[model samples]
Target: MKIALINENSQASKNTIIYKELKAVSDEKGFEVFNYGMYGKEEESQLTYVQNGLLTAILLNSGAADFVITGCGAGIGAMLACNSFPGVVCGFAADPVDAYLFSQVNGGNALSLPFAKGFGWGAELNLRYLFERLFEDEKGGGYPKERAVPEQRNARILSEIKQITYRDLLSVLKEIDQDFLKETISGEHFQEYFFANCQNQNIADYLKSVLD
Candidate 1:
């Protein structure tokens, strides 16, 4: 699977070492690393490079990225960029709870972290913790190693067919592929009923809106 790292207006050095380390971990996990980041000023002053950087991430993850990590001075700007794309579930990683919940519950595809908020080594630790823990359980190793496979297969099937109102999808007005979308999201007999009595009804709305 492809994973991307997007940073806003960074000189490339800030996240390079981390990416190298991630590559090492990724190699062990049987995952491929495809990262890209662009430096930008704080939210007070954004840049085109930062915008293009996000566009690059969208392009890379067109249908492939398993995850993406985006960072900036405070992570907010990068958050905006990642969240703007359809199907991209971006999360702000300011604490451990945010990290764990987003990773498990939402299968967050993008992470937002801050470069200057922590001490020098804190940033590194946070990176290692978020990525490793997300890939592994607190005990260690990928989550439910066996179960995840079939689950991913089922999800991939649904992912292929997921459809929603174009108004909710955040793209800047584009063509639609109705036939392909139907084939992708076609199955699942109880899809509509399963969500009816659930405690968390917003999930249904979110599911209805979010794209693959």
Candidate 2:
């Protein structure tokens, strides 16, 4: 199996450290690692739109990497970038607990972190937890299969948010015609209707605090 380690090129030294660590881990796991770092600058690790797009491409490439790990300030942007691709599951962990839960809940094929987000051991522990406690279906199949329930719920919520059908409920999403609002809503009008539906107001109104 193969794995990818992608980080902002601006933070080459930082990313390089992580690359070395992952290289050691990869040696043990018997997987190859591909590293990508920031360009031009080599210390500031800001994730830009262009970087996000490129990361997405690298992830889906023929390397057929089994997993991907990324890092930055909050681990948020990398997670967001990974999710932009369909059939891909990604998670961000700032701590061991979050790392465990993210893998369990997301079946995440990708992990992101922010060493600089917290204390000194932040990066170390984050890396240890993520690598050691990867979301594995330990039982081979039964109980692990049952674990899919909560994952499904969380996945659905994420799906709804990403799909933006909620915008249709308010007649202000503007992606669809205002006249067919009812039909555009489906799955028992469930995915959208449950978490995203709004019976009260337009998106503009909701955005502007029209109710309050």
Candidate 3:
């Protein structure tokens, strides 16, 4: 799995800590981590939570990333933003249990953390534990052993419903404001990572044209 980490400007300063914890956990699982910045540095591109969602969609839909980890101050904003997209199912978590349950039940492709509220002492420890639990097992397996079958069924149902409700990703790219879309993909390492990993030639070509 390829996991992409994105931080909104409000909590960009913690990108390093979040990335470190996530990478540590993913590394053990032989997963790759990509850091798309709002990295708390002067040189890093500043991204809003809304932009985080747009970029998350681009990465996931384009096959540049298999999963995404992103957050704003309280996680809610980013969670909602990510879920507003067609293909992204985002869940919010502030603890290990939250992480575990969300992964098991929601089987979402993205996670949003609270970077500010209640983020005091031992925050890094919390992040590490959260990441550990989040990636510990195969997701959407149901919370209790007995419920696995129905839960998996529901997950597939929800995916089908989403397809009915939303337009295809390519249409979305064409419909949204081009300037906003451009900014969403304009991060420093975006081309380096995205162009190399993206499997969808159409999306890659469109994005390359935008960059040009």
- Per-candidate local distance difference test: 0.52, 0.51, 0.90
Pairs in steric clash, model 1: 8-39, 8-40, 9-38, 9-39, 9-40, 10-39, 161-184, 161-185
Cα RMSDs of all predictions? 13.7, 14.2, 1.0
Listed in order, each prediction's TM-score against the native is 0.57, 0.57, 0.97
Rank by lDDT (best first): 3, 1, 2
- What's the TM for model 1? 0.57
Please list the residue runs of candidate 2 whose C-alpha ends up more than 4 Å from where it truly belongs after superposition. Answer: 39-50, 61-63, 119-122, 135-146, 150-212
54-171 per-residue lDDT for model 3 (tens digits)? 8999998889999999999999999988988888999999999999988888898999989999898899999999999998888887888688888888888999999999788888
Worst 10 residues of 1 by lDDT: 181-190
In model 1, how large is the Cα lDDT of residue 97? 59
Model 1 stretches with alpha carbons more than 4 Å out: 39-53, 137-212
lDDT of 1 by residue, 1-212 (tens): 56655544553457575686577768878877664433222332222324523443333334335576666677777777666545665677776556765565446566777666662766666677667766664321223555556555654554454434213342331233443322222223223322332233443343344333
Better of 2 and 3 by TM-score: 3
Worst 10 residues of 3 by lDDT: 37-46
Best by lDDT: 3
